[PDB]
Structures are given as C-alpha cells and as structure tokens.
Amino acid sequence: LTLTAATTRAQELRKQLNQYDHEYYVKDQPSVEDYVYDRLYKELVDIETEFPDLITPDSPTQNVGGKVLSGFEKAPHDIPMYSMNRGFSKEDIFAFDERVRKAIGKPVAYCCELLIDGLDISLRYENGVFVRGATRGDGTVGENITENLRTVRSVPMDLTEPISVEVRGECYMPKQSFVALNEEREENGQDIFANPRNAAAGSLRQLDTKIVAKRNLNTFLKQVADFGPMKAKTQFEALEELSAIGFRTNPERQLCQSIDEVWAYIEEYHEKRSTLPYEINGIVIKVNEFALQDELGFTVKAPRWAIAYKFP
Template sequence: MNQVEAEKRIETLRSLLEEYGHQYYVLDNPVVSDAEYDRLMQELISLEKQYPDLVTDDSPSMRVGGKPLPHFEKVQHEVPMLSLSNAFNEQELRDFDRRIRQGLEKDHVSYSCELKIDGLAVSLTYEKGKFVRGATRGDGTIGEDITNNLKTVRSIPMRLKETVDLEVRGEAFMPKASFESLNSAKKEAGEEPFANPRNAAAGSLRQLDPKIAAKRNLDIFLYAIGQIKEVKIDSHTEALNYLSKLGFKTNREQKHCGSIEEVLDYIQSWQEKRADLNYDIDGIVIKVDVLKQQERLGFTAKSPRWAIAYKFPAEEVITKLEGIELSIGRTGVVTPTALLSPVTVAGTVVKRASLHNEDLIRQKDIKIGDTVVIKKAGDIIPEVVNVLTDQRTGEEIEFTMPTNCPECESDLVRLEGEVALRCINPKCPAQIREGLIHFVSRNAMNIDGLGEKVIAQLFDKGLVRDVADLYQLNREDLLNLERMGEKSVDNLLNAVEASKENSLERLLFGLGIRFVGAKAAKTLAAHFEIIDELQKATEEELTAINEIGEKMANSIVRYFSKPEVTQLITELQRLGVNTSYKGVKRAEQTVTDSFFADKTVVLTGKLEQLTREEAKTKLEELGAKVTGSVSKNTDLVIAGEAAGSKLDKAEKLGIEVWDEQRLVDEFKNVEQ
C-alpha cells in the first residue's frame, strides 16, 4: 500500500470509527461488535505508525492516551464558567420563580430542567468542527488544560458533524459500574479506594499521564454553549438539540417546563428514582429557557440570575451506634464521637460521627446500642440526626461522661458558661500532641510533611515533647518512622528549616494561646513587632489595641507569665526561629493613594488563586480593614465560590461586590 492509498484508507477508518463510536457511546446503540471495532482501531493505529506524517490530533487513535505531561498549562475562559446559586427546599424555588417573573415583568416564563450530574465541569473548544482544547472549570476564569485526558472520553467527539467554531460546557463523570470496577482493582492492588465517583472522575482527569485516564471509562453530558459563531439559537432547549445534532452527548432526561409547578413535579419524580440511574446526581438544574430573557436577567458577581441548582436533601441512612469514644483537643476540650456500624452515606463509608458534647447526647437521648439515623451535613460531615427509640430492645446502655481525663486521668471540669468538659492539666499527653499538630498546621507554621500521623509517631517514640523539639529532629530518627523514605525526610527537614523564617504572627497563632486566633495574632505581631515586647505587655496595654478584648488580654498575660513559656520562647530563639514581625508596619505604609485605603473589606467564599490569608495580608498592606461580617459599614465584598449568606446580605445592602479575578487584577495594578 502506497501513501496515497494509505491516506484514503486512514480517512475511511476514521469515519467508520467515529460513526461506530457515536452510535455506541453517545446513542447507546451499538451497530458493530466490540471485536470488529477493535480490529478497525488496530488497523488505523498500524497505518498511522507506518505513515506518521498522516497522524492528526483529531484521529480516534488519540483516545488511547498520549505521552505523560510534566504539568498542566493554565487556560483562561473567554466567557467565565460561573457557579450556580443553590436552593434547598420548595420555598426557595418559589422565591426564585417570583424573582424571575418580577424581573421579566409580564413576559411568559418557561424553564429547562436537567439532572445535576455529580462530576467535574469542563469546557471543550472546537475550531472548524475539530476538538482543539479541553479545560477544567478552575476558578471560573482560569482552568487547567486537560485536552489529552478529555480525548480519552469516548463520548466526546473529535470531529463534529458541522465545521463550526464553538466552545461548549459539560459535566464529565464516572458511571457507577466503572467506579465499582476501578475500586475493586485498587483494593486488590492494596491501594486506597476512591471515596465516590465524583472524586474518581476528577482524579482521573487530573492525571498527568493520559493513559491512566484512558483506562477509567469516563463519560460526559454536554449542557450548555459557552460561545458560538454564525449560528442563531433562541432558547436553551434549542441549544441542547443543536448540540445533539452536532454529535455531542446530552442528557435525554432534560425537560421543558411551563411553570414552577411542573418544575416541582419534575424534581419530585427524580428524588424518587435517582437511585435507578447508572450515574450519580445530586440535584436538578433549573434555567430560564429563552436566551433573550436570560440576557435581560443578567448576573450577580458569582452566578447567573436566570438559573438555580436545587440540591436534594442530604441522604439519611440507618445504622447501629456501637460505642462512644472520647478525644482530647489541644485546649483540653473532651469531645465524644459515635462509633458506628459501617454504612455508606452520600457515596462514602461512614464509621464515626461527632456527638459534640454531653448536652447534645442528653438532648437526643442517645444510648450505646441504639439504632440511629445519620446523614452528612452539607454532604460532608457525618452527624447523628435522631434515635429510633421504637427499635430499642432494653439492652441499650446509658452513656455517662467520665469525671477524669481518659488520657492523663486528671479531673475534668466544666468552666463557667461552657457546655464542654475540659482537662486542665497542661502536661496532658493528648493536649501536647494536639498542640503540636496545631503548631505545624497550614495557618500556623505551615510545616509540610508533619501531618497528624507523623506527629503521633514522633510523640509516641518520645522524639518530641514540645514545639522546640521539632527544630531538633534527627534525620536518622525520622528514617526509622513508618513510610518515611530518604526523600520524604529531606523534604520534611527542609520544610522545618524554612518555617524558621515565618513572620511572628504565624508563631503566635501556632503557640495556641487561648482566644488568640490567626487574626488577633496578626494584630498583636504588627503592634508589638517583636515577641519580647509582647511578653512584657500588661492587660491595659493589650486592651488599648483595637480588637483585643479583656478576655483575650487576660489569657495572653497569663500565658506569658508561665516560666515554662519563657523557657520555650528562649529555646526557639536559640534554635533560630524568627520572633519578629515581617509584615508591612503601619509607620512604613504609603497607601493613601491605594483604592483600598481606609476601606472595610469582607472576604467570603472559596478563593482559587489566592489563599484567604494571602488576600487578607495584601489588603491590609494596602490600607484596608478586613472584617469577618457584612454590615452597613462594609465598603467592599470579595466573593469567591459558594459565597453564601454574606454575599446575599451585601447585595441587599447595595454594597459593591467583586469577584476574585478583579481583586487579583487590582493587586497587579498596584504592583506596576
């Protein structure tokens, strides 16, 4: 076969494989056997190897996975991929409908309803009908280029049925059968299984080696057009039909509803039969159908006004409460935890649930041996909802909180005004261990590699007894710990060394002084500048500082009055730990011409490009006052993803709202 003949055969094979793949993966209508499909694919791969100059990026052979990448490149979305606001009950949906109808005055409103797939939002870009780029949603403005991984998703067409330029959005997901097969394989290999299909899908698409993604059998539903040229579309329903016509896989369960009553009926029907699907859904997405009406309604800072996501109620399951375990926190608080018969809730196996305190146990009448209802609050934190008292046998055991600490046997006390029991022994091993964990945490000294398990090993072996010991760790001792190889030890020791250069506020927060959080630590560090001055401060001097109250001032003075604390600070200084403030001092600030000077700013929601602490520090350096709550005195709200009630309050009060990208852009302008 010469090159001309090979080129014709390759094109024929590509057309056949594209059509067979579309019938199988998109329409669920196989027209040839798997063996025949595989035979044609092998022939194509063989010819492309023989004639490499005939290989194209949109060939079906590209689905097997290319070479591993060193990292993912960043991609800016020309049209932001905004998140949706949420509704959790019927009244919130009716309020949404009322706002829509008010916004559109007398226009008739209809809605497009779709299943909310529990997966990973992605963007696909096509030029002249060819797939050229795929990206994650990221922060809505900037995502990651995962083109090679998305090429392995067989329901994503490499070439469309028309030569159009467009960008579309969809939800990549892992079908339940693929998830079960993947986890079985991971368990057999002795690896940790994925918690749920969503995590598995996200983890698969963020593999630097596309060959791994290719083995995961992912799927996708396309749900929106981000941009399109030279094609007129009037409604969302029409857009979905057009996507199907182009060869995309859309969800066949989409429904056009003429009223909010029809929307509620649609939601109810899927709450009852969601378990029958071969993929996970966590709610229903409701959109105003007519695109011109969408344009009139517009957007808030974080989401479109014309769409909302109804979230299904948290899944509740029944299990047995087998026991109650007590743990001691770094401040001595005793927390009871329910030990449960393992049960799957919202896609993960739950064995434990916090019971918070003794009063809650009494309030819910919880006994050991009870049959209980549990759920995950916000689909994340397991909690006991209630006890099924009618299933009691009489063998259940009343739980009584101990009078002595389960770790050190010191007396437990309940301080005035508190519901929690505390161990007040400063030498309690549990408190010391938890204090060490707090000291190395991200918002404190941020020592990467010193997680809870490593700290527990170091403490149990007697290698650390206070935070100063962390700066005297021996390499050989670390190599003797479980799962600690030479590279891990080197990285850990480098992280310990780097933490010595932290600014004073991190050290103050890490020391765990009662009532002194990260914000107060920053205020104290900026005011006193060196720890020696803070150690000498009186209560009167402390309360004179804005935001430092009597309770905190008293705690600080009592903490630094202890001889063992003075000894610890001296030892840390001897070991080279910085005890000075490195931030911008008020006297040195020249921010009178900054946009943020003298403004009160609130940060809310999840930030992607900056940490909350980075944003706060920079704002304060530019003269802003960063507070935790929205009021009429607030000048500006920075809203990240899932901003919630603070954003709602800001909009009601008419306060200016920025998204994270605008904040980042303003920071860049200041630096220029």
C-alpha cells in the same frame, strides 16, 4: 441572630469552607460530605445576607472554584465559567421563581435538566475539529486536559458541521465503573474516591494519559458558551442543536411552563434518582430564553437565571 455573633461565626465559616474548597476544587479529596458543605455554605449566605458588611474578598460566596495544578498548561476562558445558586426546598424554588418573574415582570418558561455528579469541562472546536479541553479552575483560568479528554469517547474530534464553537458540560464516571475502580483501588492498597465526581476529577486531572484511558468516563454537554454560527435562541433548542452537531446530551431534559410542572419534575426524579446508571445529586432549573438570561445577568459567582435544587 446578633451582629457580634454573626461576625465571629462568619469567621469560623469562611475559615472552614475555604479549606474545604482547597480539598475539593484543588486536591479533589474532600474531608466532609457534600450535604454538609451545603449546610455550612447555606448558613454563611444567610449571615452575609442579613449583614452585607461581613462580605470579604476571600469569602467562598465571592470566588468560584480554585487554583490550577503545577504540571498543567493553563487554559484561559475568554468567557467566564461560573458556579450556580443552590436551593433545598419547595419554598426556595418558588422564591427563585417569584424573584425572576418580578425582575422580568411576567411568567416565563424553564428548561429542566438533571444535576450530574461530574467534573465541569470546556470544549473548544475550530471548523469542526477539537482543539482544547479545559477544566474550570477559578472561572477564568483552568487546566489544559486536552490530551486526557481525547481518551473519553463521547467527546468528538470532528463535529458534523465545520463550525467554530466552545461548549460546556460535565464529565462523569458511572456508578458501576466507580465501584469497580474503588475496589480496584484497594488490593492496590490505594485509598478510595469519595464519589463519581471526585473519581472523574482525579482521573482527568493527572498527567498519565495511559491510565485515564483505562477508566470508564463519559460526558453530557449542558451549555453553549461561544456560539459561532449556532442558531439556537433558547436552552431547550440549544440542547438539540448540541446533539445535532455531535455532542452527547442528557435526554432526561424537560421544558416546563409552570412551576408545579417543575416541582412534579423534581418529585419524579427524586424517585428515579437511583434508577440511573450515573449518580445524580439534584436538578438544574434554567431560564429557557437566552435574551432573558441576558436580562437577569450573572452575580459575581453565579447566574441569576438559574438555580440548582439538591436532594436531601
């Protein structure tokens, strides 16, 4: 591809994607399906990779998420919330691996999890008590949704230990509830949600706590942000320590040594994809040890120690 072609094409792609980002991250009402958005974003990455000069501040590859809504107390994140690099093929995963084993200079162990179609949240605890629930917003300032998150049961008020921490995860709506809700939202004359994620988001990100409580929402915690007294050193460990202290966590997790294991994992759950009561849209491959995650660091937008495969 030529430079003169790229330039004008990137222009098309940035101009489109940032409108979609506004639709999705802000309004929670996307024009286009996800597999499309990923095609167009994947294209733009390739262009900006071939021609790093075309990278601009407002490129989607540079920001995370979107702005905060009007009537919602702001929720600053002392530790940033980031996005995640994506892959779509056997090819792409083996590549990640090779790049990671290069910069680390050895083979290393990955914790595999499922990618839940849900809304990212940040939960903050102090001496065991729940104190603030936050969206991601733009990675550094989200929205205070504490009063709404209270209506979601799997979210504990009191931990099993009187510890001060902050933990990150997804809040999703099960397929059953989802369909009931769209059906529910037709005799009303109201228009549907595109998917469980946008169902979850629209429920959580409005002001009327009473009708949030009428939806069926649930949670899975993925990551520890502020550890406080927590002793976990690896991701697989962390997950058990998250269950230990009283958080819901996805049991489908699997620690994989080699990457044939990882690929087999992805095979397996491609097949079990629609066996599950919640909509899954891919797998998450994380570097297991936290010091290794510290070694690779984050990009501007995402972690280098983690990739998210997407199904076709």
